[PDB]
Design a protein around this nucleic acid. Structure first.
Ligand SMILES: [K+]
Ligand SMILES: [K+]
Ligand SMILES: [Mg+2]
Ligand SMILES: [Mg+2]
Ligand SMILES: [Mg+2]
Ligand SMILES: [Mg+2]
Ligand code: NA
Lengths: 52, 272, 89, 131, 46, 107, 27
RNA sequence: GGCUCCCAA
RNA sequence: CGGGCUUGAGUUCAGUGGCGGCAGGCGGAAUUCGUGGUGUAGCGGUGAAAUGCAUAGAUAUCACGAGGAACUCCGAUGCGAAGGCAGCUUGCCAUACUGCGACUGACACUGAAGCACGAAGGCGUGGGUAUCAAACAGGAUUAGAUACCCUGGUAGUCCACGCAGUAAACGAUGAUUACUAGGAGUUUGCCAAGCUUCCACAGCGAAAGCGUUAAGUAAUCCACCUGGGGAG
């Protein structure tokens, strides 16, 4: 369970523009990638990471 | 709801009336009603100043509390009742003080509920609050224009207004007509929209129902003589020229609001 | 369907010998009827839940097939269960 | 399952086509009789009946001609299917491959081949053709 | 929102950052409408 | 019952007294609804990633509790009705998320 | 997958729909 | 007389 | 017809999973309109232009205000009977797969009628109406242009309720059951299921090709075909 908190942890999977990196760029597997994307979007909703 | 009549007669083929599904009592409160006299559109000199008025069913006036100055006294909703004087229904209230009053029935207000007025009242449906205390974006009705003068604005069946934003001593409200205008934040409004929104779906079906409601036949101007109407005259049918009234006032797009009225300073966007 | 293990156990104890007999025709018929009623209550509010519909119909079909098995095997048991559940309508 | 006898024939046929040496089938009385008839007529190398907790297993070891790498059985055909049952008398018993094959038939005297069915003058249900 | 704080080196860096972001590709894509069937079949063919 | 975690942001204009008043109002509403409370936190002032209501800083509060699934709607109605709050979110946490939260509270 | 087979059906559909659209509004 | 039904109350 | 069994089937328990359905809340980017500030000679568009908008103050830029619609990256996989399903979150449902040392004991498969669901477009009533855009109007290109290109623009596209019942509704391949080779990838809970994609033995096929997700080997039931046009 990746927490929507720890935004500093969350930037590990983001690029310079704040977008979500593809699963092929890193080593993630599908379940972990889905959890990462969900956490990133939850934190964006909570205004913990920028939308742009 | 509505009830569509079956076409057993030609006068009933196209008749749709209300289902009266919200009314819980049939008798009005005796201390809050009084017999009302009719005008045939005649003023105090006896001259007919307004046409097409006359007859109809006898009616009694119901005292509606449009002011709601009993701040902080809770009241219980007793009955939802028919009112012949307005398109909406009304609600009977029993205050814990022992008073009784009639209010415009909002959509969603049920018998057995509690209502309150004043600043400390919760913003629930049926409660009356100063606009300074209403959360932004709430559907409202029965809006005061001046503080203490009583609700004037949003009263017809099914109608509602919206509090769009607040700007200090004034709030911004969007009207049923689509006008956006500024209202003093010390004026009061009631939470919720007026009930009986199916009132617009009713069809009279026959001329007799208009006669019962107290309207008299309206005559077109093109079927009069020139001495009676500017649009009358001619051999056979004729179009009557530019549409206008008996006094020659144009009836297509000519504006009649006074161009120097002061209230236009509070009107942001206009729509009729 | 407000269905949980406690309610299922209560139903199995009420219908069929012992509480561990989850597979008896009577126990299955009782469970099907219970969740059929609850799904009807759900649908009357969510009238557009066409997926909960036809799930209701598949439950009805399962109950009908169990009742047909009871017909083929022991008619008296079928009379008793439909009397105790008020099914026929 | 709709036709266990046809399934048994299909298992044998598929094993032969694939080139297997042993085929395992779920057991039944009529299937055991058919396996016995096949062994007696010389179409299969061997068979074994195993009685486990289920209905049992028939283990059949097929016969291959080492001279030509050709199985002893060429065609297996189901005749009387559930959708169309076929019964014949002893006078109208079929002859398979002009007498070079066999027709397993169930008769009131038991399950046998068309040759002994004709000899004993009994008819019945034509189960299958083998050659 | 590509930011290149700072002239030829700065301009080359800005152009490279824009190319890496791919703003011109998405702009060319957004210049016209594509049916979902067209997009799905293009993805399947690619 | 069910484990929930809500995070909400208040405006940076109120003081600590109004902090305590508002958070205690929400806590008392949950308690009246019938919820037990597991852990209340306060991240204080944080610079928002993007401006909200023309404001770039906020006050972050987190509450993890247990309740029947009927009190969430009342909680959101109160949240909307209160003009002091600007952004709220709630999550129903499963077994894995509750285990992670317990580890976080233990650490 | 010649194409003429579908062209003939397309022609027939065009003719039928034209007939119906011409017959509409006339009683 | 009351009762029932109705809305135009 | 009567009795028995547990492998088929179903019920229970546990584990795991999902753009599966319905309903309520919340959000940011972009676009349109209005108001105000700066500023003035063009903007827009094409193969090239014109129509169009602009000194009675456009395009551009900053702020205030309002409203509608769609959800970048993740993102090619996954789910659903099919049609289809993708911002976040919650509530209420449904369901698949795996195992159980649990239960019942053949309770099964298919299915003419019938019923339910069923893309887009279309129809009725009431809301809403920003973008795009049939019809329509204008400007071009042409021998003409009732088109392709450009500028406008109304139904419609959005929501609720109700009709309608169609599609290249396609894997152009009906549903069950059992069996029969290899390679290369891939999702999920522990080598192994349950899937989801490409070469390819036997076999099948007129061939292209199919090939354990068969178009192979067999059994059960349903639908449909019998030269083309006329003619759905
Ligand atoms: K008239
Ligand atoms: K005159
Ligand atoms: Mg005359
Ligand atoms: Mg004339
Ligand atoms: Mg045509
Ligand atoms: Mg077809
Ligand atoms: Na419509």
């Amino acid at each position: 369970y990746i927490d929507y908190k720890d935004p500093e942890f969350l930037k590990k999977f983001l690029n310079e523009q704040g977008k979500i990196l593809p699963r092929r760029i890193t080593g993630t597997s599908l379940k972990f990638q889905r959890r990462v994307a969900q956490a990133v979007k939850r934190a964006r909703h909570l205004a913990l990471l920028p939308y742009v | 709801g509505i009830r569509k009549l079956k076409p057993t007669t030609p006068g009933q083929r196209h008749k749709v009336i209300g289902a009266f599904d919200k009314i819980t009592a049939s008798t009005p409160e005796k201390s809050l009603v009084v017999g009302k006299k009719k005008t045939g559109g005649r003023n105090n000199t006896g001259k007919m100043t307004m046409r097409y008025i006359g007859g109809g069913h006898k009616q009694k006036y119901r005292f509606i509390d449009f002011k709601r100055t009993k701040d902080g006294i809770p009241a219980t909703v007793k009955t939802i009742e028919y009112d012949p004087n307005r398109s909406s229904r009304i609600a009977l209230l029993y205050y814990a003080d022992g008073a009784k009053a009639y209010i415009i029935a909002p959509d969603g207000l049920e018998v057995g509920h509690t209502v309150m007025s004043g600043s400390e009242a919760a913003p629930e449906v049926g409660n009356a609050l100063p606009l300074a205390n209403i959360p932004v974006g709430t559907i409202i009705h029965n809006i005061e224009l001046r503080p203490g003068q009583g609700a004037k604005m949003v009263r017809s069946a099914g109608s509602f207004a919206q509090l769009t934003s607040r700007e200090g001593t004034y709030v911004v409200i969007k009207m049923p007509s689509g006008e956006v205008r500024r209202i003093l934040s010390t004026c009061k409004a009631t939470i919720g929209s007026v009930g009986n929104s199916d009132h617009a779906l009713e069809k009279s079906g026959k001329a007799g129902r208009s006669r019962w409601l107290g309207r008299r036949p309206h005559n077109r101007g093109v079927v009069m003589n020139p001495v009676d109407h500017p649009m009358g005259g001619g051999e056979g049918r004729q179009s009557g020229g530019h549409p206008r009234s008996r006094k020659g006032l144009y009836a297509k797009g000519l504006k009649t609001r006074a161009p120097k009225k002061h209230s236009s300073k509070y009107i942001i966007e206009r729509r009729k | 369907m407000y269905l949980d293990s406690a309610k299922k156990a209560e139903l199995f104890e009420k219908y069929g010998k012992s509480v561990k007999d989850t597979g008896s025709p009577e126990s299955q018929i009782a469970l099907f009827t219970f969740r059929i009623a609850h799904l009807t209550e759900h649908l009357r509010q969510n009238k557009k839940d066409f997926a909960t519909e036809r799930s209701l119909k598949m439950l009805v079909g399962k109950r009908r097939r169990m009742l047909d098995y009871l017909i083929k095997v022991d008619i008296e048991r079928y009379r008793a269960i439909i009397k105790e559940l008020g099914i026929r309508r | 399952m709709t036709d266990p006898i046809a399934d048994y024939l299909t298992r044998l046929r598929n094993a032969i086509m694939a080139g297997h040496r042993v085929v395992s089938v779920p057991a039944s009385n009529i299937k055991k009789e058919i396996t016995k008839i096949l062994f007696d007529k010389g179409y299969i190398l061997n068979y074994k009946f195993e009685e486990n907790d289920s209905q049992g297993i028939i283990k059949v070891a097929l016969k291959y001609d080492l001279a030509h790498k050709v199985n002893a059985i060429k065609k297996l055909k189901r005749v009387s299917r559930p959708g169309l049952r076929k019964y014949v008398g002893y006078r109208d018993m079929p002859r398979v491959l002009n007498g070079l094959g066999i027709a397993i038939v169930s008769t009131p005297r038991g399950v046998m081949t068309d040759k002994e069915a004709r000899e004993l003058k009994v008819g019945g249900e034509v189960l299958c053709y083998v050659y | 929102m590509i930011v290149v704080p700072v002239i030829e080196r700065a301009l080359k860096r800005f152009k490279r950052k824009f190319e890496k972001t791919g703003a011109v590709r998405e702009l060319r894509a957004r210049q016209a409408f594509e049916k979902p069937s067209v997009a799905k079949r293009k993805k399947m063919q690619k | 019952m069910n484990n929930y975690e809500t995070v909400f942001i208040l405006t940076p204009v109120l003081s600590d007294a109004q902090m305590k008043e508002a958070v205690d109002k929400f806590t008392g509403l949950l308690k009246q609804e019938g919820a037990v409370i597991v852990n209340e936190e306060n991240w204080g002032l944080r610079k928002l990633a993007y401006p909200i209501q023309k404001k770039s800083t906020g006050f972050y509060q987190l509450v993890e509790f247990q309740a029947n699934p009927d009190v969430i709607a009342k909680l959101e109605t109160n949240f909307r009705r209160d003009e002091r709050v600007i952004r709220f979110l709630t999550f129903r946490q499963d077994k894995f998320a509750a285990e992670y939260a317990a580890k976080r509270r233990s650490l | 997958p010649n194409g003429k087979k579908r062209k003939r059906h397309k022609m027939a559909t065009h003719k039928r729909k034209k007939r119906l659209k011409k017959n509409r509004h006339k009683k």
